[PDB]
């Protein structure tokens, strides 16, 4: 398929950055777009043969580069809080539609006031009620992740070292710690059900594990509190008779 | 040190009609250092008797100020705003335009 | 062209959904075709046509004879056709304009629990005070905190698989010590 | 949202002996009082009249804390000469800038305390009114200095008491102006640019507060690319003026439409020729 | 109301 590269990246606002795509296999042509919370993708610039060929409602700032093995770059300059975005790579061949449009993942990239704005999050996870075990004979965990900023997080459930996803549901947007602030921290919280004699297996380990993408290596850090460096914050509990 | 050139816009407080009096004003952001001479000109002549607004300044640190008198626009009267600023090799000279 | 569609659709597991796309201004040099955005995920296509209804594996496109709608027919949904659907009218030509996105409706997928049996249960931290509000049928609105120090999510449904079982909830928690969870979700 | 914020400019004068103090205090986009060191008495002098009333007890302790807060901007004027190791010959400004946000619910959302030396980032409070930023090594030793002296602790009593109370006085005795947004007077303008082609442009007069968005449309689509826009600018009475500009050509006028976003407005605006 | 006098730089 196609490969855009980073999957997550943050900047301060002033800030250049560059993205990369990779078309599809046996596509020539790279379309880049951007997509803003609750928003459709928004249509930047189409290359074909090294060379813009049509450009949407963006400015100058945001430049394009094909190279000669079809592969793309988005360039943008003077970054400003509003360009934080997921950035979508779809390709295709010879500007035609005969070979479909495949789409990437996309980059997150997230444009902050401050390195400061950014924490990790805390992870916790929270045992089954006795409650619920005696009335259903099921058993939920749940697992809250806490205090992050950015939305940069993937959360997975990992029972004796192996993902799961049956019994599994995760909050599909997480929640604003303090919602008038225009950059709160955010929560998330999921859940693992299981049978209550798997819970009561002491021999069954339970871990809730959140991938955080944060700042790089090369972002200077000047506060007391930790680095929030991309980081895989886990919790875990084992299963009680 | 880091020294910021003044933006100036000049306007009237009312949209203009010839005969009606109005406020003449030379609006001047984003300079820094605050030090600044800003004078109204009328037919290229200096209008005396200018205040201007206390100094304040934005989020990025740059100073403003608003300059303003009466005036009664009229159909051949020129008016003009004249900045000198350290970032001013000379002084910027903006003319007063009723459509802008 | 351009197209419209719904904000959102709502639906249960099991039903045939359809989505309509209204396009009045489509040329006869443009076609019609439909993408989904899962989470996390980038549009993937699901079907194209341009007069006659077609079929594939995913869903149904069904084309009225003016062109001026079109509607994307899915046959019996599950939890994981949940995803944002686009309706988009491309250019035929080549080289002419590139896939423009308009807004997409947001598909909602929920689950007719059997035996319901709502309950609140607090839970306590593995190393700190959670309640978990679960086995609530689908129909139930979960209300966000009024107060400033309770966070309250929104509902969920996983399925156990291996049991044939499956269950909303949703999740509430405070710092503060007059926390009590009997009231949390009322 | 409403703030109160207060902006310091102290600016040191080779040969003129003391610096020149300038404090300006706000309620959103309304100022309401001023203090300059070169007043024949200084003094605090209201600007507002929901200030206009307050007693002579009220104006003289503020005036105590501007003629401090003077003298105490010509000692640190004079340390950050020593810091960055200038001479006495030049002139230098230390600006400060703090203030409270009150959330939509009346409590306090965000308070902050920040400081620039000639135009740049000094040292700031941070989000928490606990700890500091310095943007270079002379700040950090002011940073060390105010945190053995507990500064944040000084600052973080303000910010979250006396600051959030004063706002909401303010805010309940200036109701009638500060709660009201008045809507912008708006009308689009027709100037010829050449044979084929015209400048429309889109005005918004009288309105407050100062956040406004317009823009110009073309068959629904933002041109924002080809749009020119002044920058936010007083009309002198306590409003704020704005346009936007498109060149469009003759003919095609009725293609374009301005579009008004302002709190006082019930729905967006939506403006042609 | 303004802050009062705090730590001189
Ligand atoms: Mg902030
Ligand atoms: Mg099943």
């Known amino acids: 398929g196609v490969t855009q590269s980073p999957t997550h990246l943050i900047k301060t606002r002033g800030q250049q950055v560059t993205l990369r795509c990779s078309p599809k296999s046996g596509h020539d042509t790279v379309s880049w777009y951007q997509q803003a919370l609750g928003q459709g993708p928004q249509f930047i610039f189409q290359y074909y043969e090294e060379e813009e060929r049509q450009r949407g409602n963006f400015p100058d700032r945001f430049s394009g580069h094909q190279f000669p093995n079809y592969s793309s770059e988005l360039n943008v300059n003077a970054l400003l809080l509003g360009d934080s975005a997921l950035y979508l790579c779809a390709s295709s061949l010879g500007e035609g539609r005969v070979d479909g449009y495949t789409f990437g993942s996309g980059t997150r990239l997230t444009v902050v006031e401050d390195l400061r704005n950014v924490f990790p999050p805390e992870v916790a996870v929270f045992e089954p009620s006795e409650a619920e075990i005696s009335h259903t004979q099921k058993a939920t965990l749940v697992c809250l992740a806490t205090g992050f900023y950015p939305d940069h997080v993937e959360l997975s459930w990992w029972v004796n070292g192996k993902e799961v996803h049956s019994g599994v549901c995760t909050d599909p947007q997480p929640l604003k710690e303090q919602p008038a602030l225009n950059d709160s921290r955010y929560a998330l919280s999921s859940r693992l059900r299981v049978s209550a004699t798997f819970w009561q297996n002491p021999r069954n380990h339970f871990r809730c594990q959140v991938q955080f993408y944060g700042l790089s290596e090369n972002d200077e850090w000047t506060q007391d509190r930790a680095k929030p460096v991309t980081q895989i914050v886990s919790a875990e509990a084992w299963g009680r008779a | 040190m880091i020294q910021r050139t003044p933006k100036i816009q000049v306007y009237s407080r009312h949209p203009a009609e010839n005969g009606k009096s109005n406020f003449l004003n030379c609006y001047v952001s984003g300079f820094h250092p605050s030090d600044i001479e800003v004078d109204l000109l009328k037919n290229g002549e200096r209008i005396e008797k200018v205040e201007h607004s206390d100094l304040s300044f934005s989020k990025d640190w740059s100073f403003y100020l608003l300059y303003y008198t009466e005036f009664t626009p009229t159909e051949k009267d020129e008016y003009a705003c004249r900045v000198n600023h350290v970032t001013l090799s000379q002084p910027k000279i903006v003319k007063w335009d009723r459509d802008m | 062209a351009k197209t419209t569609q719904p904000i959102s659709v709502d639906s249960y597991e099991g039903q045939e959904v359809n989505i309509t796309c209204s396009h009045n201004?489509?040329?006869?040099?443009?076609?019609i075709t439909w993408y989904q955005q899962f989470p996390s995920q980038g549009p993937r296509f699901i079907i194209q046509?341009?007069?006659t209804k077609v079929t594939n594996e995913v869903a149904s496109l069904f084309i009225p004879a003016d062109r001026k709608s079109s509607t994307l027919s899915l046959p019996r949904v599950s939890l994981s056709d949940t995803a944002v659907y686009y309706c988009?009218?491309?250019?035929?030509?080549?080289?002419?304009?590139?896939?423009?996105f308009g807004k997409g409706t947001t598909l909602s997928v929920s689950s007719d629990i059997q035996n319901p049996d709502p309950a609140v249960y607090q839970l306590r931290d593995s190393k700190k005070s959670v309640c978990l509000f679960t086995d609530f049928d689908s129909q139930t609105n979960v209300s966000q905190s009024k107060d400033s120090d309770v966070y309250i999510t929104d509902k969920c449904v996983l399925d156990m698989r291996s049991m044939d079982f499956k269950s909303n909830s949703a999740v509430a928690w405070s710092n503060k010590s007059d926390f009590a969870c009997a009231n949390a979700f009322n | 949202s409403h703030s109160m914020r207060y902006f310091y400019t102290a600016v040191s004068r080779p040969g003129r002996g003391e610096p020149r103090f300038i404090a300006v205090g706000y309620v959103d986009d309304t100022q309401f009082v001023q203090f300059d060191s070169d007043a024949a008495s200084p003094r605090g002098e209201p600007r507002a009249p929901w200030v206009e009333q307050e007693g002579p007890e009220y104006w003289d302790r503020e005036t105590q804390k501007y003629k401090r807060q003077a003298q105490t901007d010509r000692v640190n004027l004079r340390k950050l000469r020593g810091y960055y190791n200038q001479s006495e010959a030049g002139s230098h400004t230390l600006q400060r800038m703090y203030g409270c946000d009150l959330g939509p619910d009346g409590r306090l959302l965000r308070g902050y305390n920040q400081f620039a030396y000639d135009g740049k980032d000094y040292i700031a409070l941070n989000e928490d009114l606990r700890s500091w930023t310095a943007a270079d090594k002379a700040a950090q030793i002011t940073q060390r200095k105010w945190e053995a002296a507990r500064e944040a602790e000084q600052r973080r009593a303000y910010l979250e008491g006396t600051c959030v109370e004063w706002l909401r006085r303010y805010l309940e005795n200036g109701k009638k102006t500060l709660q009201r947004a008045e809507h912008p007077k708006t009308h689009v303008t027709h100037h010829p640019v050449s044979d084929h082609e015209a400048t429309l442009r889109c005005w918004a007069l009288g309105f407050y507060p100062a956040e406004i968005t317009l823009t110009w449309q073309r068959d629904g689509e933002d041109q924002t690319q080809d749009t020119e826009l002044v920058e936010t600018r007083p009309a002198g009475d306590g409003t704020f003026q704005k346009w936007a500009a498109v060149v469009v050509p003759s003919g095609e006028e009725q293609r374009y439409t301005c579009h008004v976003q302002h709190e006082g407005l019930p729905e967006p605006l939506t403006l042609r020729w | 109301g303004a802050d009062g006098v705090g730590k001189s730089l």
């Open positions: 988009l009218v491309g250019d035929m030509d080549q080289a002419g304009t590139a896939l423009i």
């Open positions: 201004n489509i040329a006869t040099n443009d076609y």
């Open positions: 046509g341009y007069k």
